[PDB]
Ligand binder design. Structure first.
Ligand SMILES: [Zn+2]
Lengths: 131, 69, 257
């Protein structure tokens, strides 16, 4: 978010077509940010605060941001206001650059380890039952 | 021999007593004999007022190995 | 008591066309034969083009229809038009009155013709929502008032099934597979009700067996099986099926998450 926010400051004066539609660019950023902060997160759920700080959006809109993120197809999921959570059933497959892969490598290493311990831990117990 | 009883009673009776009431129960003529006794009873005292206080997977395999012996 | 049997190719062509028309509703025709008063069999389907207006009477296209008919004749598919599919995406399965009038336009062709409503979107990888029924959530429209529901089943040839088997090759994945839960609800229920049923049979055998000799008892009971063995027996399937049932989930939760 921030780095982009820096980038726009220069060229936004330069290209007049960018001078118009700054609103778009802002929305679009907030979205992409949201999408990622969900995509990396191990268990997918969010408070509204989390999205607020992540997107630097005051939290009223946060539910407009989420709802609009769905109506474009980007997310599926639901909103629970009472507790201010966002469940995010699933997030759209999207072509991934280099760095974003690394985190996937990580989470997949984790979910390899959990199995390491579980499988290797279940012979001991019930060693008297095997065939 | 009686007082512990009441004590051993009241421990489970209800968690909450004003000190004057403990004096009432245990037949003290004294206020300080109370917290003497309660310390001897290890009772944490608040200003006259006393308070008296395996994964499922494992379970499954356990049932199994118990069955196939 | 009345029922329809819907062949596989019918159902798949159905759901395909429906899912393809979303979010607009599609219609087509149903090819089959009436076995008796109690049965309609649907072996075939073909798809009817869109109309500027919604699904309606004139949406049925004569030119298109017969044009399809003969070209199926050359393939030997000759059948009556036994009903007409349809879809109410997102709205569940019911007939609007406009659905009704058309359904009548298929009554006066054949008195037993049926209506089939398919619902593409909320039909999902779990239960598929499908409905078939004919005239006189859904009760708002007079489920029982203007029309009435029917029942559905699926004909499957041996070879059909055999093709379907090889879709999923479960040979590697078995052991992390959890079979349908509702089915083991009827299981874990009907099993218990049964154990109840034979409980007092074991009771009657212990009382009667008490006051009557074994030689006399054998004469009576040899026909059926030793209700103590339905306890010893039946307790098991519940036991182990429920232990693998528990463990399997305990593993899927911690391992897969
Ligand atoms: Zn309709």
């Amino acid at each position: 978010f921030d780095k982009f926010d820096s980038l726009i400051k220069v060229q936004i004066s330069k290209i007049p077509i960018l001078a118009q539609h700054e609103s778009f660019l802002r929305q679009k950023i907030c979205l992409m940010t949201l999408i990622e902060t969900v995509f990396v997160k191990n268990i997918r759920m969010l408070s509204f605060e989390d999205i607020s700080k992540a997107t630097h959006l005051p939290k009223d809109n946060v539910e407009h941001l989420v709802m609009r993120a769905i109506s474009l197809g980007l997310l599926k999921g639901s909103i629970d206001q009472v507790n201010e959570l966002v469940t995010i059933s699933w997030v759209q497959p999207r072509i991934i650059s280099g760095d974003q892969i690394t985190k996937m490598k990580d989470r997949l290493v984790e979910w390899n380890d959990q199995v390491e311990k579980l499988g290797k831990k279940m012979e001991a117990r019930g060693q008297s039952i095997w065939v | 021999a009686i007082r512990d009883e009441i004590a051993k009673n009241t421990e489970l009776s209800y968690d909450f007593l004003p000190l004057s009431n403990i004096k009432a129960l245990l037949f003290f003529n004294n206020e300080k004999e109370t917290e003497k006794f309660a310390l001897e009873r290890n009772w944490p005292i608040v200003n006259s007022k006393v308070y008296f206080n395996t994964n499922i997977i494992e379970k499954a395999m356990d049932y199994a190995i118990s069955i196939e012996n | 008591k009345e029922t329809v049997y819907i062949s596989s190719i019918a159902l798949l062509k159905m759901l395909k066309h429906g899912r393809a028309g979303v979010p607009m509703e599609v219609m087509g025709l149903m090819l089959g034969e009436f076995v008796d008063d109690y049965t309609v069999n649907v072996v075939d389907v073909f798809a009817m083009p869109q109309s500027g207006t919604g699904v309606s009477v004139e949406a049925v296209d004569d030119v298109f229809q017969a044009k399809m008919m003969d070209m199926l004749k050359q393939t030997g598919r000759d059948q009556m038009v036994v009903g007409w599919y349809h879809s109410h995406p997102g709205f569940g399965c019911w007939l609007s009155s406009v659905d009704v009038n058309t359904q009548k336009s298929f009554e006066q062709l054949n008195s037993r013709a049926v209506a089939v409503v398919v619902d593409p979107i909320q039909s999902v990888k779990g239960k598929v929502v499908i409905d078939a029924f004919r005239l006189i959530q859904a009760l708002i429209h007079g489920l029982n008032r203007h029309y009435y529901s029917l029942n559905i089943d699926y004909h499957k040839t041996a070879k059909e099934t055999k093709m379907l088997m090889n879709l999923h090759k479960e040979q590697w994945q078995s052991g992390l597979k959890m079979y349908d839960y509702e089915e083991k609800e009827e299981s874990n229920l009907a099993a218990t009700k049964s154990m109840v049923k034979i409980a007092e049979q074991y009771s009657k055998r212990i009382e009667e067996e008490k006051e009557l000799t074994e030689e006399e008892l054998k004469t009576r009971y040899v026909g059926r099986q030793d209700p103590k063995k339905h306890l010893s027996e039946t307790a098991d399937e519940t036991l182990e099926n429920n232990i693998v049932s528990v463990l399997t989930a305990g593993v899927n939760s911690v391992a897969i998450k």
